[PDB]
Amino acid sequence: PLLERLKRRVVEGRKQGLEADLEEALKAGHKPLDLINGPLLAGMKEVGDLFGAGKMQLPFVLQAAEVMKRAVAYLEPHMEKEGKGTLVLATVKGDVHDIGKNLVDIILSNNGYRVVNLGIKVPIEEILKAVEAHKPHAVGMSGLLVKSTLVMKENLEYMRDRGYTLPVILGGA
Amino acid sequence: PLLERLKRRVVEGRKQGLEADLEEALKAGHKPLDLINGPLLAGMKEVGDLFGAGKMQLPFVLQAAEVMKRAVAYLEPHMEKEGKGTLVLATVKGDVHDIGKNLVDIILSNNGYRVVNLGIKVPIEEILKAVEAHKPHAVGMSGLLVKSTLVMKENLEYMRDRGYTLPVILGGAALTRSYVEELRAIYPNVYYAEDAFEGLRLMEELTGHAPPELTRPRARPVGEAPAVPRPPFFGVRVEEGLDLATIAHYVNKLALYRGQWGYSRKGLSREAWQALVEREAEPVFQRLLKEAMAEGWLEPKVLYGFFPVAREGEELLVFSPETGEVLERFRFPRQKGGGLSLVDYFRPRFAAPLGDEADWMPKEAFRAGARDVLGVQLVTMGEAPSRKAQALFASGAYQDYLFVHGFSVEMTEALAEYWHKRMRQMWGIAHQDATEIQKLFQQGYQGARYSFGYPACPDLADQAKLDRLMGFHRVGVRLTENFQLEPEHATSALVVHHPEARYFSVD
Amino acid sequence: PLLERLKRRVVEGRKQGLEADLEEALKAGHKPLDLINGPLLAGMKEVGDLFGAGKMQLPFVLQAAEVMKRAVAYLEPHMEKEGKGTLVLATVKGDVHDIGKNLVDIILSNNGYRVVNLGIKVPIEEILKAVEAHKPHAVGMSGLLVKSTLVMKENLEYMRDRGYTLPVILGGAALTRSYVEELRAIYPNVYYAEDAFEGLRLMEELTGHAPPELTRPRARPVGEAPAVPRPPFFGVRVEEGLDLATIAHYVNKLALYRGQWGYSRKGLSREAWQALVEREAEPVFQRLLKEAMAEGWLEPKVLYGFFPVAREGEELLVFSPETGEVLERFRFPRQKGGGLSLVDYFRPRFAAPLGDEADWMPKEAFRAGARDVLGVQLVTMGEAPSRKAQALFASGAYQDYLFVHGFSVEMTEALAEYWHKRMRQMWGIAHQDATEIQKLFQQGYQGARYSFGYPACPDLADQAKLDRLMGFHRVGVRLTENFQLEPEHATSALVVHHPEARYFSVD
Amino acid sequence: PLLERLKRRVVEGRKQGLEADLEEALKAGHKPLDLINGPLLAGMKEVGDLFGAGKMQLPFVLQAAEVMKRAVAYLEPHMEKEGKGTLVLATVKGDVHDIGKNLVDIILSNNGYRVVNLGIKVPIEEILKAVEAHKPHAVGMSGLLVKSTLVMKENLEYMRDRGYTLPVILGGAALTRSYVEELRAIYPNVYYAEDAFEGLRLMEELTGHAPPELTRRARPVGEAPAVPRPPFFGVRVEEGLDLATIAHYVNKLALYRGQWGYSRKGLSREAWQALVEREAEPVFQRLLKEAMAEGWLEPKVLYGFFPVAREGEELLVFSPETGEVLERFRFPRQKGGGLSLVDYFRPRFAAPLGDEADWMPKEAFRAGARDVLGVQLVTMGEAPSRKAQALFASGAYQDYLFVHGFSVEMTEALAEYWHKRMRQMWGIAHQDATEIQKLFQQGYQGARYSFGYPACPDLADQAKLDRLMGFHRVGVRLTENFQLEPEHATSALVVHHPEARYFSVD
Ligand code: B12
Ligand code: B12
Ligand code: B12
């Protein structure tokens, strides 16, 4: 069917002829939010399984995310929308390095979570203002250097002192 | 490397960025004929393997040939010319049909053989003058109709009488394998070719690039009809000024996509076929209608009418509406052991009238004994599509050459079908027509149309009798000496009202 | 393990190190019969599956059988035996041809059936004595020519008259499937075998090791010739002392590699075939030439000549050069509905001479009315290659048996071809010969040679008329009761000068 | 084709009909070097992949190398010749052990590298003379014992002091990965090799044919029942030993799995039993028939008993004749005052348990000796070492493997057999095992402690044992790293105490 074909276009990373197949499938009788959480997300889920096992390489994972991002862009006019949960994601104060943080943003966003990317050199005052506004499931913090981890610690001390109990996912080189 | 990329460009059919990649390969130190007989020809051989196995469809084969033809055109200034061998290729005397011949030309030329295309209506005098000049490995001859095969025979008799022993590759719609084997009597070195790729294999074997393989009643008895239906008039009138959009609704989309364009339906689902039609087949059909309407390269005409007729034994007489005298007589063939004939759908001469037909049957004809009414139509799409197609083939758009041909042909058939509907309405026998367009192709209507040449009425020289009645000049149609219609995109038919009339084979 | 290694040795055909691996397996505690009916026969059955599917070629099948035969020879002193079933196998009375029969023997024996090979020229008296002694599951009979099938019929009539009901597997070159089905009239339990592997499957079903399946308008008229060419002499002379190197240039390498040795070409490229020839086919051909020259197991002889002839109606008369009296007449068959015959290539009796042939035609013959010249050749390679092959088969070199047979056969054909060239030169009709050796096999020369038995002149009893003219003893050749040439590697031909003469089929 | 057939002959290990197939390929057109660098080396690399994945066992790997070695020998007359690179390979100064080094030689040589095998007891002066001559890609050094690793360190100190920087691949039984990483201090370009195939991968990376990867706790011991009395005091020879009787004590798993590399695990018990019957057992049966008839095992034993005592942490050994203390052994104790070997010995001047004063040597007992220690040295002579070097030289690499491991496990079997015999003599064989299989589980009274093992690990105490026993008397010699020469020889201290079993200080 066309359901298996939309899953295929994610896993292979085939953009050219996608907008034709999306326009066709609504007519087959599935809604915009339907196809997103169905074959496409399994295709993405499948690409996650493949990369986990070392059978797909990282340039094709991001080629899959390009297809998913382009699918959601085509289906956004039809929708008047509310993902699986939110991550407020920032690089720490005194750090300019944004490849790891932005890689998280790509994977989470194209797996149906909401990512509020706050950029670089973000102090904890700004991060917790975002947590109040959005009310996410977790906070993310990216560093580079070991002095960036020391800022992350001061930020956890700040967060407990204010009385946040929300999960803090830390990552960094 | 870039060697594998030039092979890839042929097999995928990618023209955009070709002339960059050719220019890069020459500076990298590769000679013109090096690339030509190297990766490019390897690409065109792979496409032949794929088409042989049914993994590439014919529109992409001709898309590959476009790339190869465009490569050779770019490398011709650098080269100072001389292929693998030569075919002198012609359509026979009294024949105008050039799609098969030109399909051979495309495949052989882009597989590195030389093709000397001599055109249409080519006599054997002209063909053998070319054989003297070029000294080819083989001579090729394309027909259409069975009278074109009888010319091919006379040509082999001519060629043996002159003392040619060179291989003669024959191909054609009407030409069969069985018949070419019986022609080995006259000229032993004669080979049949079912398609262009059979023609390529023959040319491979004949030039030594292959191992020799190819080279070595109890039925329903006649019923009286309900009534003699009354025509709008008697005699024959012209009709131009027909909407191409109305005719396009009668196109047999499978006969066009599978039959003519070679888009394979077999091997995949009906949702998989439906998706191919939406993506590939339908938008090409939609583009060529917009074009043919705006550019004016289909010119639909119709010549049509009705006549007082009768059966007298095995002959169908045709009476003049004005004089009542017998104009033509058709002796149609009957099936084995009594069996069915077309004359069996017509009332006998001086038959006691079924209804009130003496009220309206032409006075003179009815006194002469005419008791039934026969419909006749010629349709045509003009010389224009033939011209448009020769333009594309000449410029080297071989894909579009294919598409535009088949479109024109199936649009011509669609007009015969549309006008049949219209011939029923006029006659007043369109009470029982199909609700869908799809069920008109299975004869979902009263009576039927019998074109001359088909088994029921197969003598093509009866088309001269039909022109004497109708006047084919009146829509720019001409008969050749092999009784083909000129232009090629035209089809005559006898329109029968009798409800029991359906198609049958004498052979 | 070593069990898988003994299976491997059969399928790959590795005899070097076999007797070590057999000795190791028995001391490991494996009995002789355990090995025979086990790891080995599994190997030989896999090779049968592979050959059935076209993944192993016939020179490696017989290389497998060499290993199996050598294994059983090593294990026979230890054993005191007893196969799966017995075939009594013979070549028929009045036939000397033993490659097919011996190929059956090799395949069946190395697949665990017992074969009682009775040799050549075996009458049914002798065959049925063997059936009484051994009490086999089936009788086998091999022929060559169509007169050998007529003996097989008389043998089935003999066998039913005696009251044998045992299955009779018939095979042969001339024997067809259609004919063996008509023989089920006489003897219902008769089966055709296209190859040895069909013979194995029959023997499987008949011994219960298999699911029963097998067991249940146009012509060209011939014109007068340009002139009557003059022969070097009239009558027949011998020629010995022919270079085998010169003859080897006329060998049809495909007919040898594909046709005889069973090296498959099809399904691979022409560069892939060319590489196989270089590695496998060509060095074997090169070895057997060096051998046949040094060891002297081809003895090329030729008996050849020319005669004053005429057509008188449908009979080709042959006049004596010395007396002028009619020696033989040949009534040759004509194609259906008065088509072509061989007599049509010969001038009529008392025909007014084309040129100045009365200057040189034998005085007596020409007064008697002879007006044309017929050439005749017999070639032979002697009893020697038949002897050499029987040696190899007996010693168990089944691969070399295959190679040496086909070599001898295709070298015999090459001599007929070489000598035809030489027969043209002598006659003075070699102006128009081929530039390549490859185009002599396409009849690239004036006239043609018609061997008796082929469709044009198929009566094999006319070979006795040819021996009365030529004297076949003069190159050690004899006719049997079924009109076969002894030795088997010999071929007669009628050599025609007329330029319009090419090959045709009455059937 | 014949190209795929020459590859097949390597991977299956089929030498019979090889020289026919080589002669056919070259007269067909192929060049010797072309065949060397192609189908043959492709074969040997596939066998390396298989062994890497655990699908081909070590006796067939060396059967593949036999074919490759025999191919190159046949094509050497045709060639007028330069491997992929060179390893200069030696066993260290004061070491005679050459099975590991020669196993490296076989694998590397038959994978198209050049190996300059310098033999045994090779000093660094000699090794670096070879490095100057040949200019190799790497230097290899094989040891056995931990004293051989200490020489390897001094060699790296020598090599850096001279200013060599080229890679040093170290391997050895006693050598560990952890130690070679600490040696990168002295000589940074030093790599450990667990097996020959690790040695091949290093040589691949170092010659550029691979991506840089590798290259970047008590119980109390109580008093004994009694002091058992020995047949005599002092040390005697025994040479009249049946090889058939010793063969009953061979640890067939240690031989088949441990030495020959026939893997058991991942198959059934009936599948292993069938492999033993077909492959392992008839080789064991062949080499016994050979070793008996050809005489290439010469079993000797030096054995005896001594008056001893504990004096604190020292085990004194008294003279049977003079009573004076000849040797003292300070054995190590487990962490935080756990077990020592001295704890199996009665204290000096201990009040006798039974009537040992009746028979203990008068002088020794007055000097205070109160317990009896047994001692044995076994050996199979220089003969098996010679037989193995013959096979390796001839190129029978499979038989080289088999004959080595046989000799080694037959040497251990003799230590075990003679232990049984040492119990009987002593009169402590009431409680022996009914099967031979349960003697490997220590199914007997007391235990034997070989020097070098954790309990008693100072190998320089083997010189104290030679001063007592006289190793020359069975043709055995100590080297400067305290190795027994010949290599197929093993000393043990034979303890009577029933509570004595094996323990680790580390
Ligand atoms: C569509 C079609 C038409 C079109 C004609 C368009 C055209 N001429 O291409 C239309 C609808 C207009 C039509 C009309 C008629 N038709 Co019409 N037509 C067909 C149809 C259904 C398919 C034609 C087609 O497109 N073939 C594909 C082309 C490309 O194939 P091809 O030309 O044979 O070429 C291939 C091979 O033969 C080979 N080849 C050809 N020549 C050569 C030469 C060489 C050297 C080599 C190597 C290879 C080679 O190469 C090609 C493949 O690569 C056929 C059925 C059939 N063919 O079996 C009937 C058929 C040809 N028509 C027939 C007839 C009866 C008629 C009419 C006489 C109707 C009437 N007026 O009474 C007319 C004739 C046309 C005319 N102009 O006079 C008959 C002929 C009967 C006979 N001879 O006795 C056929 C055979 C139908 C039948 N089943 O009996 N028709
Ligand atoms: C090469 C050949 C020759 C060789 C003969 C040597 C030989 N026989 O091996 C040569 C070049 C010398 C030659 C000469 C002639 N030829 Co010639 N020749 C051929 C050819 C091309 C191939 C024969 C061949 O060797 N096949 C391979 C062998 C192994 O096949 P086989 O014998 O049939 O056996 C197979 C099966 O039948 C089966 N089988 C056979 N017997 C049995 C029995 C049992 C129980 C079982 C289970 C299976 C079995 O096993 C084999 C496969 O595994 C054939 C064409 C053909 N066969 O279609 C003509 C053919 C046999 N030739 C023929 C003739 C005319 C001639 C001559 C008479 C020419 C002349 N003198 O005028 C002579 C005959 C020779 C003679 N001594 O009299 C004719 C016979 C026609 C007829 N009888 O009327 C044939 C059929 C050609 C034709 N198409 O008409 N020929
Ligand atoms: C067999 C053996 C014996 C033999 C030793 C002599 C021999 N092999 O001929 C016998 C049965 C005689 C015995 C006795 C002894 N042994 Co012991 N024995 C072993 C045993 C059980 C197995 C070793 C083996 O089979 N090696 C076979 C060869 C092929 O392996 P290898 O030398 O390791 O080589 C491999 C790799 O290291 C690599 N490699 C080696 N060198 C190099 C170099 C390079 C450049 C490369 C790339 C690779 C490389 O290649 C090989 C694989 O391909 C070990 C246990 C162990 N290893 O865990 C103890 C062991 C060697 N024994 C040891 C000792 C104590 C002794 C004795 C001193 C006992 C005594 N007398 O008191 C004697 C000494 C023998 C003598 N001649 O001096 C100790 C050493 C302790 C120490 N150094 O402090 C060990 C480690 C036992 C232990 N677990 O503690 N034993």
Author numbering:
A (entry chain F): 663 to 743, 746 to 837
B (entry chain C), C (entry chain E): 663 to 743, 746 to 880, 895 to 1185
D (entry chain D): 663 to 743, 746 to 880, 896 to 1185
Article passage:
We selected cyanocobalamin (CN-Cbl), a stable and synthetic Cbl that does not support catalysis. To that end, apo-Cap:Cob:Act tMS crystals were soaked with CN-Cbl, yielding a structure of the holo-complex, solved to 2.95 Å resolution and one in the apo-form obtained prior to soaking, solved to 2.4 Å resolution. In the holo-Cap:Cob:Act structure, the Act domain remains positioned over the Cob domain, above the Cbl cofactor. Unexpectedly, the cofactor is found to bind in the His-off, base-off state. His761 forms a hydrogen bond with the phosphate tail of the DBI lower ligand, with the cobalamin bound in a His-off, base-off manner. Tyr1132 occludes the upper axial face of the Cbl cofactor, much like in previous reactivation structures captured in eMS and in contrast to our reported apo-tMS and apo-Cap:Cob:Act structures. There is minimal electron density in the upper axial position of the cofactor where the cyano group would reside, with a water molecule positioned 4.5 Å away from the cobalt center; this is in accord with previous reactivation conformation structures of MS. The absence of the cyano group indicates that the Co-CN bond is cleaved, likely via photoreduction during data collection. As such, the observation of Cbl binding in the His-off, base-off mode, without an axial ligand, was surprising and indicates that the captured Cbl is likely in the Co(II) state, and the cofactor was modeled as such. The requirement for reorganization of His761 and Tyr1132, in addition to the need for a reductive partner to reduce cob(II)alamin to cob(I)alamin, priming it for reactivation via methylation by SAM, indicates that the captured holo-structure is one en route to reactivation.
